């Protein structure tokens, strides 16, 4: 696991509902507005691993974290995302393929000691959608998650 996390960049992904996360866990894909797509695509080219750490708002927990497998691609079968009020699929950028590293949950109470230096040292659970997490802080956060024996780490390693 630590090899997968080496020198990774971590991003806090705040979904407004559980459905979108369930979709992401079932289909291994993710999407977002173009401006955020551009940052993720640029970060994928330049970083050894791009880890998304998911947290559904109000849930009090992280729902897991996944690693970008590639830049975003267009022209796929439409996914039934639950989008913010007033957003349509036409406003979305492409779709990202993601390999889940851990699908198990982590409550905020087990991360109360981890503070994000890149967000005024507030607890890592606190942050806006997209807030980047400092390397060591993000690494420790991922290591607090329960082990998930259902994930094939070699499938993700071969893509690095
Ligand atoms: O990707 C997201 N945010 C970010 C910001 C900045 C950089 N990287 C990433 C993000 C997507 C969401 C969504 O609910 C969402 C989704 F699940 C699927 C499709 C579109 C949408 Br909209 C929340 N947050």
UniProtKB/Swiss-Prot annotation:
Binding residues annotated for RNA, in chain numbering: 14-16, 30-31, 81, 129
Effect of residue 33 to T: Reduced binding to N6-methyladenosine (m6A)-containing RNAs
Regions annotated as coiled coil: none
GO biological process, one term: mRNA splice site recognition
Keyword Nucleus: yes
Effect ascribed to mutating residue 52 to E: Does not affect ability to influence alternative splice site selection
Stretches assigned to the YTH domain: 8-145
GO MF, one example: mRNA binding
Impact reported for residue 15 to A: Does not affect ability to influence alternative splice site selection
Subunit structure as annotated in this protein's UniProt entry: Interacts with SRSF1. Interacts with SRSF2. Interacts with SRSF3. Interacts with SRSF7. Interacts with SRSF10. Interacts with CPSF6. Interacts with KHDRBS1/SAM68. Interacts with TRA2B. Interacts with KHDRBS3. Interacts with EMD. Interacts with RBMX. Interacts with ZCCHC8.
Name of the featured protein: YTH domain-containing protein 1
Whole-protein residues included: 348 to 507 of 727
